[PDB]
Amino acid sequence: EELKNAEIALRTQKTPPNTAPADYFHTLVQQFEVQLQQYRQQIEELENHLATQSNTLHLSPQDLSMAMQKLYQTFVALAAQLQAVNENFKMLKEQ
């Protein structure tokens, strides 16, 4: 990334020898806009996993069963998605 930046920089330099900086600043705004929420989500998840590890002392075996049933449902609807993509691409290669 740095190398491509420097190459284009050299080109622009050989061309030279305020709107752009304000636009770059606003882009720097946009970049972090979502990242603040990424931090907030990861923080709420850190609190959640900390609370769960507080229960990680022993607990009752059933939650695994719940996650396994949701896992089979997830893989099933995912097979729906993947089979759908396969069938549509096969219709394309037919066309």
Partner: peptide, 14 residues
């Protein structure tokens, strides 16, 4: 486990 933490988060959010 950050994916496990995310999945526990998805349990918590769903």
């Amino acid at each position: 486990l950050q994916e496990i933490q995310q999945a526990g988060e998805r349990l918590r959010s769903k």
